[model samples]
Target: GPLLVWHRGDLRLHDHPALLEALARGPVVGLVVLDPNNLKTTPRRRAWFLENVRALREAYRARGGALWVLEGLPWEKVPEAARRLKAKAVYALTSHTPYGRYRDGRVREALPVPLHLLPAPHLLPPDLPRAYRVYTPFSRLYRGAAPPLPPPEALPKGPEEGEIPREDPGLPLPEPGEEAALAGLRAFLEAKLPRYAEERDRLDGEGGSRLSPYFALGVLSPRLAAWEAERRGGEGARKWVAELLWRDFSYHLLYHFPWMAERPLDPRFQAFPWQEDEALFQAWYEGKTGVPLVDAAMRELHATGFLSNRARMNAAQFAVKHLLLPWKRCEEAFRHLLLDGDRAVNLQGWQWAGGLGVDAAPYFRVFNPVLQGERHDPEGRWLKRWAPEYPSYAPKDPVVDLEEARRRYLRLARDLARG
Candidate 1:
């Protein structure tokens, strides 16, 4: 009567609810299925995922367990595997995004045994019980909902792993594994947390934790992050906790209003016109738009599958306000390239940049890429690092004039409320 621990998001053995439950039920069989649905990963993301799974398998092996990886949808893989192994029930971590919810529901219905969904990777409360559109109150409600759960020291055994197909990662990735995640967190708290509040937005400085991929993989627990940082009790820890809550807020919004993914949460702008120019989009995507900071951020994302928070905001806002492109295209392109593309956060971020989502920037508040550039990347260190020819070539002849572009975008956006 072994339990099946279906590895979905939380790949790490530590702070994993389903894995802990499976271990408690005696013997446990682990399964990792490559979902071919909307959950399909980009090349770099797939490579990172494969490497992390391999790490998890090795970690399991070290603790007297085994992991079986297969190819197929969850509905197809979970049921077949359960029947083959005579699993009593299946335990898995639930996903909050629309696509994830559908995928899990189909799997739950198809599985021959009971499906147990445990929450992790987020510290959100059930049904919200309050308005989460405003982030401050939302954080206050959920920050201490549950104390951090400790990781297990040992686990039960499972079937042997099958062949892991090779993937050509278009870009290099950071070390992918639970151990790496922990190490990164430790390094951040020791070295960066003290100045995070003051410097997180500085393009010239290494500001953010860069632990987003680990959060996406559930290699780092949100609760664990809260516990560790809150104990330090400084502005840095407090600010970082707010950042974590912002992520959780995105999930809460997505889960409660799944329709927010495809449409604007603020319905007034639903009729606003959207323009498309493949040439302009390509320029933005390929980092040739000629704006120093935006181009550098675009190039950074293209070369490394990552970008700083400021870089992401600057790049995204430029596309929507300066290039006059629809935010959806920007979001799709970002999701396609980013290794940490969680649908909830990705969609929400794009909508925020476009002034159409919950807690969005004001409609007329177009981000002036030039001003942001002057303030954040002052000496242009980040710009030169990513786009070598900065002041001389790129920023000289930008695709659109900053002042004129902002006026044009503001005029268009102002039309939504006019009589």
Candidate 2:
């Protein structure tokens, strides 16, 4: 009987334990399902995911295997596909996110075959502490229990017969699959990762490896990334590796506290007054917020589905502190725009921006958008690229007066705290 390997976020073959296990069981059949629930994904993000899936198909073809691409909910389609393929077992890399867990549970219950779960995308071992509310403590615990790497498994013998759909229903695919991911990783490490720690936040500089989209979609795995970094020794490489661990920590947080996706983890924020102003939110979402840094960041997000970490903070702070908007609004906006938006990271980051989550920024620590632009985007290169009217004094003044807005926000916070 064939073993079914369901490709979700873990899209690649190298360093993939689930794929390895499926191959070990018997003839392996690969499948990727496109759920309509993902219709919330922006055009750019949908395109990116499709491109990577196509890339993965090509990689499988090169190895004399074919990826079975299907469209629809996994729980409904996965069992049906497994039955059709005569798969006696199904395997997938475990995902900690709430939706993934829920979907997998349903699929397992619906399937007649044994469903096996494996961990591959994370650097930390699965048996490590399951709950972490803060990054430092989480990172420390993860570092303490660093899992030994599993050696790369050889590709399985190609199946003699299989069927891949002649047409894909999802958004037109981006440069599809693992070969592109491998090439991208090589190009990044060889060219940009050397200066990653120092210039990572440079808005106009190619300072960091742009591998998140690949990593997020599972075009590449963390183990492969970690192994590559270790093979290339340097302070830069070490720093980059640590950053990957941070991603593990974030995912771990979400895995344990699924409610963080919808509201604050601490619960106190449930009572906090969250104002909803449609017009204000529209302005912010459209990058017409009037704050140069905020506008530039939003514009960048809209235009390219990418923004610098510094820009993220500036935009987030402006939304929360300067405009007195609720973090939920910003969270939805980010989800709608960011190509690499993961629910855990997005929620944690938005809470940090609003001074409402674990390890949050101080409420009083309002970021001055103008000063932030002068400091981080010193030459206004980012602002110029996104908001070209800034230097010419043609950009409109901020929608709200910064000083007055901050004062009002602080007062509201105090009132909410006392209640």
Candidate 3:
């Protein structure tokens, strides 16, 4: 019987451990189970995942291979697909997320044949024995990575199955698929990589490689990216690779402390009084908060399904600190708006920005939205492009007084931390 290669978040063919390993044993067939649990997300994210699934199928066909796309719960759909193919066993990369773990366990139980889980390429594995709360120590554990495996020359023939459904993203999507991802990577290395360190934090986000959407879907492997960057050898490569390690650090943080998903990593922040005002939340969500920087970031995210890291920090910090909106709700809402959103990365980002202590970020650290805008956006062209209504960094009839809100939050937060 042929082995089944199940593609989940790890969507691309290159640097795919499970796919390559399955092929080594005998003839192999590819499977993508469109589990509704994962698909019950914003239209843009749902559409993005489906498009990549289609891309993977196209890639397989281009190489004289077969990919089967199916829908339903993984336990049900995965087992059914295996039976149809008479697969001897199911092969897939291990998933570290809470849902991924639960779903995989269920699928393994439901399947008749053995399920072999292989490690996916990561700059740092999430399940390392030792856990580090701080990034620098965790990062030091990685000596280096070997060159990523090349894409397979050919795949054994098998029957393809199912259709990829269509849905409107409601916002423009970046070019989807591995080929585009590789092309974007090549261009970034040649053009943007040298200046990445200086330009990465720019509010306009032009200084950075916009390959995050690809990274989010595993459409491009980070190991491959890091390897290519190392081969180039520069300050930019070092800085850029550090950011990729940050991505791995986010995953490692979640794996060690799963409770961080619903609560803050620091014990003191557990009961931090997050305000539950619908109007305040709505204003921030809709880009009508009247704070120029926050409004621009939110508006840009809604319009393009993308935002610069600096913009995200400002926008998220404003919600958590100045507006005092509930961070969990805001985090979910914000994640839904972005094309590059991932649970581990987004949760880590919100907690860090909110000073809820993901990275030992001090609770007192708060961004002055106006100053942040002037510092990063500079000419204010980025602000003008997204939230053109704002003539300056100053808030216009803002929902809350910035000084008063900052003082109020600091006072409350100081009390919480001290006690």
Candidate 4:
């Protein structure tokens, strides 16, 4: 009973409901196809993902299964492998994003066997409908959902071998795999959770679990992570569980509204007066925006492939509101740069910051870079760490008058609404 388990980014065997379905079918043949058209990750992200891809291969081999890393459309590579292995069927986790939906469709047509689409990699509520637009109600419904599947104790081995490809990440990174991920989570829960709620947004507060990369790369089991946090009772547990629920909300939104990642979720914002300025976009991207917080955050993203939640918000608000750039354009920059960037999470964050996504904010919320910096990054230490040569070394004039831009943006919104 050989089967093809085509991993569409879920890299671990533990709590992998889809993988378990494959395990039940006997020996599993793993496949990863790098389609340049869809997945254009940062060099750092690509390298980090490369690490887990190797780990996935090793994990399967340890269990006596074979995985292959191939290049081309999944439609072609998957069928090629299935035919070679004489697989009974093909299995993969479901995709809710527009791009994922499109790619899966093509792969299904070319597959020699049935392509079994499993539930999301995260916990989903059965009683609730799938198209809930907002997060508040959806999260309330999911609180009592079923626990995730346990990690398989043993899996049948495959007869062939899979390769782990490598690339440059441009930074020093800790070892990333399921083994390291679980250990990291243990350390985080033991120490970090105690004060996580108090200092979750501190730039240098040494708070928050740095597990997003693991989650994004599918090296960590999301369901298991959420459940582990749920078991630990306290303010920390409550806050952390809420955060996980937000991730669940993100998946749900993307699943129902596939165009969310492609365009504005709120249709009214479609005709908002949006502009494209090369100088402004370049200034934001190059960290030459003349705003310390925005410049530092942009530089941090460019250099390290990471930025805190607050920093990202301030930076994005400045671009979309002050700079008057399109959300899709600015989001593309974020997608190419962040290590933990994914269609679901990346789009959600960008859309929310732009004040049009899933958040209940009334209008396009604007953030003052200086005020936001003084409040969140208070001491300006975060700025120095990322862009040391800024503020003093170089100075940039305001890209556009912030107050003037905000007034104009608000006026446009109300005028459009009235008409």
Candidate 5:
């Protein structure tokens, strides 16, 4: 009997415990369910996901295996496929999000065969002590508790004996599989990591790791990245590795504080009155915020399904601080736009920007978009690339009278604090 490997976020086979477990069984059949709920993603994000699936399918075929891409919810599709293939068990990576957890539970209960779930996202095992609330502490704990890295396993000797789908209309294919991911990691380590510490803040520079999209989509695994970074010893390599650790930390926070997804982590923030300015939000979303830096970042995110890490922070700060918008709104917008918009990270980032999460930046630490642009994107190369229509010689007047917005924000913060 063959084992069924249900693909969720973990798209690649390398360093994948779920896939490895499935392979340990007699034979393995890869399955990807195209739930309509996932199809509600933004066009660019949907396209990227589809491209990646196609790439994964192709890689599986080349390795003498088949990836069955199916439609409908897992409960509807998984048991049917398992019954047809006479699968003895189903294996998949564990996900911590509320919706994902619920769905997985339902699928497990509905299936007749054994369901095995493994943690594949973090370098440290998911059951590690110290549910981290802050990035620094989390990073330290993760570094100390790091698990042994798994080497990339070779593909099976022959093609899959099961049926392969003719076409999948769910979404467009994302970038090709582990090959692209591996190439990206190699290029980043060889060329970019050395200068990462200095240039990571620069929006236009190629100094930061571009491996995030692949990691978020599970096209790349953290173990592979961690191993590579460890192999390439340098200060820059350590810093790059820390960024990956942050990803794990964000997910850890979400897993422990599930309510943070819908409500503020800090109870005081729940009473904060946020202005309902749909027009302002629209301006910000459409990159017409009139603040050059914010506009530039928004434009870039709109055009490309990616944005620099610094840009994401600054843009998020501008939205919550300068614009006086609620963090939830900004989070929703980012989720709609970013191709790598993991729910945990998106929510964590928004709360961090809004001073509403554990280990959040101080409420008074507002970002001055102009000063940020001058400091990080001095040449305005990234701004020009994204927001070409932004005037070079605009009036010295601050965008949206920042002084008033700051006053209002402070008053609101104070009011929330009082409660």
Candidate 6:
């Protein structure tokens, strides 16, 4: 009987343990169920996912293998596919999200065959016995990652099924699939890796590898990336790998602090008053905030489905600290605009930037959005490209007085901390 290798977030054949394990046992067939929960998302993200899935199917075809894509609930469709294929067992990389756990559990119960879930490749396991509240301690625990597993050379022939529908991503997308991802990684290491630490903060986001979209979908494995970077061995390699570890840290945070998805990580900020101004939110969302830096960042994100780390921090901080918009709503809105958005990563980023307390970020350490732009984007070329209306980083008839808003937030935060 054939073994079924289910592909969810783990979209690629390269560095995939479940596929190898299934092939070792018997003939294998790939399965991807388009769950409504995941697909019911922003058009760009949905297109990114479907394109990658299509890429995976193409890779399978090139190897003379079969990949079956199905529409509907995983619990129902997975079992139905198994029965149709007469699969002896189902194999997949373990998913750790709350919904993933629930979905996998229901699928397991519904299926007649054994379901074997191998741990997905990671720099560090997400489910540590003691989750570190800070990154430094957790980071020290990673000695290194082993070399990544090789992609399969060939797969046994099986019947493929389902059409992968195409939709407009509403913006240009990076080349999809693991091959392109691997090539892009190599290019970044050779060209940009040397100056990554210095240039990574640039507001235009070109200094670092723009591989997060691939990483988010598991099209490119982080373990593989870390291992390769370590092999190169330089300050750049170390810095780049640290960022990869941060991705794992995000997973660890969400795994331990599940409530963070809905509320602030720090209890003090849970009841912090957030403004309920729809007009303010609309302005921010549409990049009409009149604060040059925030507007530029939001505009860039809207147009490209990507933003620099520095721009992201400044933009998130402006909303959280200056505007006093609800952090959760802001986080969701920000995430839906980005192509590389992941629930855990985006939540962690917002909390860290907003001083909602995922890490050592202090509440009083509010960013002056204009100064942030002046420091990082120097010469204002990026601002010119994104929000050209602004003559400089200075506010232009801004929506709120910056200093006043900052003081208001500090006063509110101090009272919350004191009480």
Give TM per candidate. 0.94, 0.88, 0.99, 0.90, 0.91, 0.99
User: For residues 1-419, could you state the per-residue lDDT of candidate 2 as single tens digits?
Assistant: 77888888777777778887777667777888877776446676666766666667766767667578777788888888887878888899886666877899999999988889987656764335557677676666543223333423334444433333344323333355677777878888888777889877665535777677677777777777877877776778878888787667666666677677777775655566666788888888888977777787888777777777677777776777677677876787787677677666677777777777656445677776666667666666677778886783223677777779878888877665555
Once fitted onto the true fold, the runs of candidate 2 whose alpha carbons sit more than 4 angstroms away are 125-130, 144-176, 266-268, 392-395, 414-419
| Count of residue pairs whose backbone atoms collide, per candidate | 0, 7, 0, 4, 11, 0
* Model 5: per-residue Cα lDDT at residue 415: 75
Model 6 misplaced regions, further than 4 Å: none
The alpha-carbon deviation from the true structure for residue 21 of candidate 1, after best TM-score superposition, in angstroms, is: 1.5
lDDT of model number 6? 0.92
Clashing pairs in 6: none
Between prediction 3 and prediction 5, which has the larger TM-score? 3
* lDDT of each candidate versus the true structure: 0.79, 0.71, 0.92, 0.75, 0.75, 0.92
Worst 10 residues of 5 by lDDT: 161-170
| Per-residue lDDT of model 3, residues 267-352, tens digit only | 89899888899999999999898999999999889889999999999999999999889899999999998889998999999999
Poorly placed runs, candidate 4 (over 4 Å): 39-41, 125-130, 389-396, 417-419
Error of 4 at 4 (Å): 2.2
Every model: Cα RMSD to truth:
2.0, 3.4, 0.9, 2.8, 3.0, 0.9
Q: Against the true structure, candidate 1 has what lDDT? A: 0.79
Q: Give the distance in Å from residue 176's predicted Cα in candidate 2 to where it truly belongs.
A: 4.1
Kindly report which residue pairs in candidate 4 clash with one another.
64-157, 64-158, 65-158, 67-162
lDDT of 4 at 347: 81
Q: Write the per-residue lDDT of candidate 4 for residues 1-419, one digit (tens) a residue.
A: 58888886788878777778887867777787766764465678778877788887777778766778877787788888888888889888887565777889988888758999887556563224557777777776765335767766656666664455678788866677799999988888888897889878765435888788788877886778877777766789878778777777777777777788767787777777778889889999888877777888888788777778887877887787777788888887887787788767878887788877466555656776666766666666776887665553123466777678788888777665455
Candidates 1 and 3 compared: the better one by lDDT is: 3
lDDT of 5 by residue, 48-152 (tens): 666777778877777778678877888878887888778899999887677788888889888999889887756655445567667776676655224433533
